[PDB]
Amino acid sequence: MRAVLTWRDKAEHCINDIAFKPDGTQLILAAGSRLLVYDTSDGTLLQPLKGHKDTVYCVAYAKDGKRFASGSADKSVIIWTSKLEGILKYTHNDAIQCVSYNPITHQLASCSSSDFGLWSPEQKSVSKHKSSSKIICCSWTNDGQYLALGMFNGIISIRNKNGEEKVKIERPGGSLSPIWSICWNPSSRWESFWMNRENXXXXXXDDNLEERNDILAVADWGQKVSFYQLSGKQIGKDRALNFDPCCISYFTKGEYILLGGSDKQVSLFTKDGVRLGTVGEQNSWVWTCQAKPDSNYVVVGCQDGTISFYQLIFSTVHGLYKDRYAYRDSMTDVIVQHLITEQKVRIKCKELVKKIAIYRNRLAIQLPEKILIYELYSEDLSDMHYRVKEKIIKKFECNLLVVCANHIILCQEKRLQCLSFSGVKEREWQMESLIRYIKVIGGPPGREGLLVGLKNGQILKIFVDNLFAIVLLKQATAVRCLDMSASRKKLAVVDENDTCLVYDIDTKELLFQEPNANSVAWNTQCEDMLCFSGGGYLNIKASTFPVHRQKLQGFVVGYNGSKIFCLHVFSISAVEVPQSAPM
Amino acid sequence: LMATKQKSNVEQALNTFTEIAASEKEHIPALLGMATAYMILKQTPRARNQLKRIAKMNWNAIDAEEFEKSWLLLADIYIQSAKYDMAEDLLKRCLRHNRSCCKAYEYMGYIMEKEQAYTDAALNYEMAWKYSNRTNPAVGYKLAFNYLKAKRYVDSIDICHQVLEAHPTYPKIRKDILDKARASLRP
């Protein structure tokens, strides 16, 4: 997990709520006593919109992208066109808290201290409907049919689109645990509704709920988060915290959660409420964390007036062996794919998955606080029945991880450790420079060769049953990537200047080189043939002859028979070789 | 013998201190003895002059702690008299010889709160909170309460968490500071 600050700004005042245009082109911020309009690309502030008298406690923006609602301490609500003019003013009973447009009908809600004011577009009246309590936060059901309200009294209650109240839940403790934000999960058929478009006055004055599929994220100042159905039933258990949370929030996908608060950061979670990481940490309280439409960007607002725009990068985690691509799905599962039979198996963890490695009959997975060893139960090469062999409850720091027949191999930042299954260390090796790359190159069970590449450009072979590391070669630049041919006679190396170099190992001599490479593999059966990717091309080379070039983006992970296992930005693609051409 | 507060022990202590002071009229540890024994004996007017006597002298590194103690005890007696200006002078003179003194700041923060300077009181209470290693929950309360009155409700709630962290079940703070700061937070 990685997050990058794309741009930053600081307002004159505190920032209370955030709205995005549905195409993601503009960001609107309820800062102090004005609305601020921002470009999401680079944070240029286009205009301070002037209409309100007092504190703009929130803003929200309708799914058609024509109109947005903003609410004030001066009791007003204003409906702004996307032409940035405030065509229909309104004036509520007291100060506004949260406002929220309906996903389907564009019907608005506007919450206040006792009273919540529903209306549907350009009708002549508003349902100023009454509440037991201060109405802190509001969210429409994903199909648009219920508005759910959270109360300072520690109750969540569910109201239909007409304003009748249908369901209640109390957090045990009541007003001890104020509900400061709630959110319905976006994950249903309606998310593509309004995803197909290419197009100042005053306004005066439900059964079988267990079969309704929606799920509600609740963040309460008892310092707990929990998920709930429209039936009022709690899902699982309260995911405890050590802070006052705010603005529990989701990406467009409905699968990852953002969680801001008095932890002064934006924490990231699964839809099961398991922690996955940390978006940028902050000088002051976080009030707001809004994911950008259609994309992995995030925007944050804090008590000190800082706005921060982050890109989340979600790196790739995988390993291949000969023909078994194992890779990270969600951020908690490994999908292991038999590339000949096209079978898949899912193994579910209960944490983040940080590292994966695979070898004949052995799979290994590293989580934040344990490492898992998995075993195929049969010697059948078509088997997929992985069982957990052993589970090492120990925390590790690593740069790289690999697995062998009886051992886990850990690369710490200049040091290689061999650990038994069951965690007892066997042997260790100390390099003359920082390790940049490692691969297992096969062997008999328990004497396996490892192939190692260093930042100084030295290349080593290390046998897991031996205390001394064997120099194969040294190079003028760092090893970026590294592979051995089917017989173990030949080496391919990527030199960290984006070139591939190819060597004889038995004589320690360069055969040939190529001026554009990023990843490389030998054909696993047909020696004297290899493949690499670089600069937007796939490149197949046979036996010192010219190289076949065709357009591709993605990277070569392996090469078997007539197929090259290229990896696209999320999934394996299995390109086929023109055998007729090298022939 | 003073610290027992048993009257015969405190009178014996006063007598040894006055005997030493009669042999050595500038002996600060004995003069602080006289003042402290007289305070325990409720002879506060006799303590007052025997501290003024010390307060006129130049400081030195050997008597430094008894100087710093004597100025603080005299500053307390000046707060009983309500002539806070001489207490503030003694507290600041104490800090000029030793900037670490938590009791010099804690008395000064109380004067700033009496003067309705809730911000400067919060500055003194922040030093006293910090240099208590957050083990003074009474300053914890005062710091949160002064942030509440300064219209700094988030900062008040920060400290109400830090007090409950420092001491679970600590009385008063949850209802009065924490829930009134929460109740203001969106008005």
Cα distance between residue A169 and residue A218, in whole Å: 11
Do the beta carbons of residue B77 and residue B94 sit within 8 Å? no
Question: A20 exposed, middle or buried (CB, 10 Å; 0-12, 13-18, 19+)?
Answer: buried
Q: Which residues of A455-571 form beta strands (DSSP E)?
A: 458-463, 469-474, 481-484, 490-494, 500-504, 509-514, 519-522, 529-534, 537-542, 547-551, 555-560, 563-567
Question: A233 exposed, middle or buried (CB, 10 Å; 0-12, 13-18, 19+)?
Answer: exposed
Cα distance between residue A411 and residue A450, in whole Å: 12
Instruction: Quickly list DSSP for B103-118.
Output: HHHHHHHHHHHHTT-H
How far does the CA of residue A158 sit from the closest CA of chain B (Å)? 22
Resolution in Å equals 3.5
Method for this entry? cryo-EM
Residue A537 structure tokens: 């091309």
Task: Kindly identify which residue of chain B lies nearest to residue A262, measuring between CA atoms.
Answer: B158
Do the beta carbons of residue A168 and residue A187 sit within 8 Å? no
How far does the CA of residue A244 sit from the closest CA of chain B (Å)? 10
Within 8 A of B159 by CB-CB distance, chain A residues are none
Do the beta carbons of residue B173 and residue B157 sit within 8 Å? no
Q: Which residues of A106-233 form beta strands (DSSP E)?
A: 108-112, 135-140, 146-151, 155-160, 165-170, 179-184, 201-202, 215-220, 224-229
Contact A303 B154 (CB under 8 A): yes
Within 8 A of B155 by CB-CB distance, chain A residues are none
Task: Kindly identify which residue of chain B lies nearest to residue A303, measuring between CA atoms.
Answer: B154
Cα distance between residue A225 and residue A238, in whole Å: 6
Task: Kindly identify which residue of chain A lies nearest to residue B179, measuring between CA atoms.
Answer: A176
Quickly tell me which residue has 């998310």 as its tokens: A191
Within 8 A of A285 by CB-CB distance, chain B residues are 154
Do the beta carbons of residue A57 and residue A96 sit within 8 Å? yes
In DSSP terms, A266 is beta-bridged to A260, A279
Instruction: List the A547-551 sheet strands across, edge first.
Output: A519-522, A529-534, A537-542, A547-551
Task: Kindly identify which residue of chain A lies nearest to residue B161, measuring between CA atoms.
Answer: A243
How far lies A245's CA from each of A4, A239, A262, in Å?
A: 23, 12, 6
How far lies A58's CA from each of A32, A129, A281, A371, B61, in Å?
A: 10, 20, 23, 45, 61
Q: Does any CB of chain A come closer than 8 Å to the CB of residue B161?
A: yes
Contact A57 B157 (CB under 8 A): no
Contact B186 A57 (CB under 8 A): yes
Q: Which of A48, A44, A42 is nearest to A12 (CA)?
A: A48
Contact B158 A136 (CB under 8 A): no
Within 8 A of A152 by CB-CB distance, chain B residues are 183
Contact A262 B182 (CB under 8 A): no
Within 8 A of B183 by CB-CB distance, chain A residues are 152
Cα distance between residue A41 and residue B12, in whole Å: 82
Return all residues near A226 (Cβ < 8 A) that are at least 6 apart.
A218, A234, A235, A236, A237, A238, A239, A273
- Integer distance in angstroms from the first to the last C-alpha of chain A? 45
How far lies A162's CA from each of A90, A92, A119, A121, in Å?
A: 19, 18, 9, 14
Q: What type of residue sits at position B49?
A: N
Task: Kindly identify which residue of chain A lies nearest to residue B159, measuring between CA atoms.
Answer: A262
Of B154, B161, B187, the CB nearest to A95: B187
- Integer distance in angstroms from the first to the last C-alpha of chain B? 57
How many residues in total does chain B contain? 187
Chain pair A-B, CB pairs under 8 angstroms: 18
Q: Does any CB of chain A come closer than 8 Å to the CB of residue B30?
A: no
Within 8 A of A262 by CB-CB distance, chain B residues are 157-158, 161
B contact test, residue of A135, A223, A285 with most B CBs within 10 A: A285
Cα distance between residue A269 and residue A259, in whole Å: 8
Do the beta carbons of residue A64 and residue A77 sit within 8 Å? no
Cα distance between residue A155 and residue A185, in whole Å: 19
Give per-residue burial for B58-89: e unless 16+ CB within 10 Å, then b. Answer: ebeeebeebbbbbbbbbbbbbbeeeebebbbe
Contact B187 A73 (CB under 8 A): yes
